[PDB]
Amino acid sequence: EIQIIPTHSSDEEANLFAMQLASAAVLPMALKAAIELDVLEIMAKSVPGYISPAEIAAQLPTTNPEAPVMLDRVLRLLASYSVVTYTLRELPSGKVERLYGLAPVCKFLTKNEDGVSLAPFLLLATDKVLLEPWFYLKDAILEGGIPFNKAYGMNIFDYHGTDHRINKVFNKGMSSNSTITMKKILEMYNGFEGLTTIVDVGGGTGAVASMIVAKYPSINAINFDLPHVIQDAPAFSGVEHLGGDMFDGVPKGDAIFIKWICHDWSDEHCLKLLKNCYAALPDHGKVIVAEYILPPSPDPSIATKVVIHTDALMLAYNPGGKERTEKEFQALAMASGFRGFKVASCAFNTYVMEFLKT
Amino acid sequence: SDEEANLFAMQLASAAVLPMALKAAIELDVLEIMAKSVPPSGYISPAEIAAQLPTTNPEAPVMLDRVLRLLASYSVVTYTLRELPSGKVERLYGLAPVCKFLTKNEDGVSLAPFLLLATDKVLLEPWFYLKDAILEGGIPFNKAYGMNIFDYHGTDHRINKVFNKGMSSNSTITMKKILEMYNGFEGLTTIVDVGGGTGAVASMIVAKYPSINAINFDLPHVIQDAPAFSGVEHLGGDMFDGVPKGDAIFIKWICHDWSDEHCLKLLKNCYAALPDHGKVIVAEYILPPSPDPSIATKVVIHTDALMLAYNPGGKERTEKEFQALAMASGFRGFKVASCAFNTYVMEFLKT
Ligand SMILES: Nc1ncnc2c1ncn2[C@@H]1O[C@H](CSCC[C@H](N)C(=O)O)[C@@H](O)[C@H]1O
Numbered sequence A: 001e002i003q004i005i006p007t008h009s010s011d012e013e014a015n016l017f018a019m020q021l022a023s024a025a026v027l028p029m030a031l032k033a034a035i036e037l038d039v040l041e042i043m044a045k046s047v048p049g050y051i052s053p054a055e056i057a058a059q060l061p062t063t064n065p066e067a068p069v070m071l072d073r074v075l076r077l078l079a080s081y082s083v084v085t086y087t088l089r090e091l092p093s094g095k096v097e098r099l100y101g102l103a104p105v106c107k108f109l110t111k112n113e114d115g116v117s118l119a120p121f122l123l124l125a126t127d128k129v130l131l132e133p134w135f136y137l138k139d140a141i142l143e144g145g146i147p148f149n150k151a152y153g154m155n156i157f158d159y160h161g162t163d164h165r166i167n168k169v170f171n172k173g174m175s176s177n178s179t180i181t182m183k184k185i186l187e188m189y190n191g192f193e194g195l196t197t198i199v200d201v202g203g204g205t206g207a208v209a210s211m212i213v214a215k216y217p218s219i220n221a222i223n224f225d226l227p228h229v230i231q232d233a234p235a236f237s238g239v240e241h242l243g244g245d246m247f248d249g250v251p252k253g254d255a256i257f258i259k260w261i262c263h264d265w266s267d268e269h270c271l272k273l274l275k276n277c278y279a280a281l282p283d284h285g286k287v288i289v290a291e292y293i294l295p296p297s298p299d300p301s302i303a304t305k306v307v308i309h310t311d312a313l314m315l316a317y318n319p320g321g322k323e324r325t326e327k328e329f330q331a332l333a334m335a336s337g338f339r340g341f342k343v344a345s346c347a348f349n350t351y352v353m354e355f356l357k358t
Numbered sequence B: 001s002d003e004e005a006n007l008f009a010m011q012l013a014s015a016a017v018l019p020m021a022l023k024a025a026i027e028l029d030v031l032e033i034m035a036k037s038v039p040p041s042g043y044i045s046p047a048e049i050a051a052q053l054p055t056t057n058p059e060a061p062v063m064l065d066r067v068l069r070l071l072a073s074y075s076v077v078t079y080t081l082r083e084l085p086s087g088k089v090e091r092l093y094g095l096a097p098v099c100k101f102l103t104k105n106e107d108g109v110s111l112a113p114f115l116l117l118a119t120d121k122v123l124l125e126p127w128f129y130l131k132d133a134i135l136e137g138g139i140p141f142n143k144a145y146g147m148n149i150f151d152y153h154g155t156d157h158r159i160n161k162v163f164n165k166g167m168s169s170n171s172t173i174t175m176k177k178i179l180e181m182y183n184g185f186e187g188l189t190t191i192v193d194v195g196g197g198t199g200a201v202a203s204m205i206v207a208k209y210p211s212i213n214a215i216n217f218d219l220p221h222v223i224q225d226a227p228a229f230s231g232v233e234h235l236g237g238d239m240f241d242g243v244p245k246g247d248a249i250f251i252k253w254i255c256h257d258w259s260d261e262h263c264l265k266l267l268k269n270c271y272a273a274l275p276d277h278g279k280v281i282v283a284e285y286i287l288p289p290s291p292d293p294s295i296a297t298k299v300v301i302h303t304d305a306l307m308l309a310y311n312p313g314g315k316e317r318t319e320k321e322f323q324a325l326a327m328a329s330g331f332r333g334f335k336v337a338s339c340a341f342n343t344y345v346m347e348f349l350k351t
C-alpha cells in the first residue's frame, strides 16, 4: 500500500469529487428527460452514430429554436458518462459541433427485438414519487419509521393503490426489468421443467408467469399479486391472475416463484411469507427465489454497486427491506421449514435459489 | 459484455441514491461525528456514530451502516472489515480524502452547504419540467415555480439562506486559493463584487488588502442576509439597471447564470462603471473541448446542465466564448490570470 502525500494536486481532486457528488443527481435526471423525449430511440432509428442535436430536434414535436442546443447540452453530459458516444465536426465556419451515437449501454435503454428495455425501469427509479422519501431519510433514522411512509402517510404498496399514475409506472418498470432478466434465467435454469402448476407470488402484471408458460406450454401458472396490480394484468393463455395479500396466504401450486419479493420485507415478514409458501406446496414442492445476494465487501465494482444501491433504496421505500447474503437466505429457508437450499443460477446479478422442502 | 451493459443501466437508473444518501449523512452530521471521533487507527463503528446522534431509535446503527456501505462503495468514506466470531463480517468506517471538503476545516468552512443546496427539494423539482422546456421553450425552473430562480429566492427564505450559504462556502474555499496566486487586486482602491452574494468574497479581498474599499452588490433579499464585515459596503440593486462605480469589478459565477444577451448587457454596464483603464475580473469555469470522463470536466458539464435547469439561460462557455463577450462589450484586452478548483480568473481589460 503506497501512501499518497496530500498536495495541491490531491486537494484539487478531492474538491472536485465533492463538487461532482453534490450535483450527481443531474445524470439520472438528464437521462430521464432524454428517455421521455424519446431521444435514444430517435438515435437508434435515425443514425446513419452519429447524428447532430439539430437532426434529433427535427424529429421532435417542437418549434422551440433552442431545442437543438438544449439537446446538445444534455447529450454532452450523457457522453461524459459513456451513456452516449460523440464525434466532433468542425463547422466550415470555425466552431466545433458534436454529433452523437449510442453507446453499448443503450442496448438496454432502447427497445430490443421483442419490444423491451430497461428505460421504463429508469423512469420508475427517477419518478417524482420516489425522490420525495429521500428528504425524510434523516427523520426516519432519528425518529424511526420508513421515509416513504413519512412522505405520504402510508406504505408504498398502499400508495400504488391510491396513485394510479405511479401504479402504472411501477408495474411497467418492474415488468420490463423482469422480462429482460427472466429471458436469460429461462435460458440457463432448468428448475421449471416438469412442473404442472406454478404460482408467481407478487408477480406484478404477470410478465414472468407469461414467459414461463410460453417456454413450457404444459405448465399452468397463477399470477398472484395485490388487487390494484391484478386489475391491470393483461390476459395471457395459461395464466390465471388472482388478487390477494400473500401474508394472508398464497395459492397452491407445485412450485412458488418469488422474484424481488424477499428484499422488500424484514426477516419476520419473510419468514411469514415463506411459511405461507411452505403450506401451499406439496411434500416435495420448492420455492424458487430470485434475488440479488449481498457481496462480501462494498467494493467499487458496478455489480456490487447495483446491489448496494438497491439495499439503500429498500431503506427509503420499503417496510424493512434489505439485501441479504447467501447465508442469510439459507437461514430464512431452514427457519421456515425447507430442508434443501441450492443456488441454482445467476443472470444479470439476479441469483436463482431453490428452497426445497426435502 | 451484455451483463456489464445491463448492470451499468441499472446503476444509472438508481444513481440519485448516492447524492441523496450523502445529503442525509451530512444533515445527520455523520461525517463531522466521524472526523471528531475516529480513534488514531482511524475507523469507527456505526453503533459508535449512532450513539452520538439525538436518537433513541434502536434501528439507527443498522440504517447508518447501510448508508455508509453505499458511501464506501463510492470511496466517499473508507472502510475496514472486522470478522465476527460467528463468521459474518462487520464494517467500520473512516474518512476518505473527499471528507476534507465535506467537513469544516480550520477556517470553519466546507463544501457541505453546497451539497445541501444542490440536493435541495426545491432544486429537484425543475428536472420534471425539462422535457416540457425542451419541446415548448422556456426554463424548467420557471415552469415549476411562478418565476425565475432569483425571484423565487426572494419568496422562499429557507432556500434563499441555503443557496447563499452554499455559494458562500464554495466561494470561500476557492477564493482562499485564488488569493494565494492572483495579484490582480493590488493598486486597486475600490472593488465592486457584482452578484457578490452575502459578501464572503468581498470580505476576503479586504482582509487581504485592507487598503481596498469593497462594495458587495447583490439583490435586496440577499443583501438582507449579508453580515457586516468592516471595509465591505453592502448594496442592494439590480445589476442589469446599473453597476456601482469602482476601480475594478469582480464577477464570480455570474456569467454562467445568464444568456449571451444578458451577459452583454451586464458587461456593458460594467464597462460604464469603470474608469478608463479599469478591468472586470471574471471567475468562471471554462468548458473543456470534449465530453471527457475526468472529474474536472464532469464538474463543468454538471454545472452546465444545472444552468439549463435553473437559470435564465445560463450555460458554461469556452475561453474563446468569453473573449467574444469581452470584445462585444467593448473590452480591448483579455487575460487568463490563474485557476483554483476549475475556477479560472480572467480579466477583461478596458485598454
Ligand atoms: N401483501 C402483498 N401480497 C401480494 N403481492 C404483494 C404484496 N405486497 C407487495 N406485493 C407485490 O410485490 C411486488 C414487488 S415488485 C416485484 C414484482 C415482480 N415479482 C418482479 O420481479 O418483477 C409488487 O408487484 C407488489 O404489488
Ligand SMILES: Nc1ncnc2c1ncn2[C@@H]1O[C@H](CSCC[C@H](N)C(=O)O)[C@@H](O)[C@H]1O
Residues within 6 Å of the ligand: B150, B167, B168, B170, B171, B194, B195, B196, B197, B198, B217, B218, B219, B222, B237, B238, B239, B240, B251, B252, B253, B254, B257
Ligand atoms: N440582477 C441581479 N443583480 C445583482 N445580483 C443578481 C442579479 N440576479 C442574480 N443576482 C445574484 O447573482 C448571484 C449568483 S450566485 C454566485 C455568485 C457569488 N459571486 C459566488 O461566486 O459565490 C446571486 O447571489 C444572485 O442573488
Ligand SMILES: C/C=C/c1ccc(O)c(OC)c1
Residues within 6 Å of the ligand: A124, A125, A126, A130, A156, A260, A261, A263, A264, A313, A317, A318
Ligand atoms: C425505484 C426503486 C426500485 C424499487 C422500489 C421499491 C420496491 O418495492 C421495488 O421492488 C421490490 C423496487
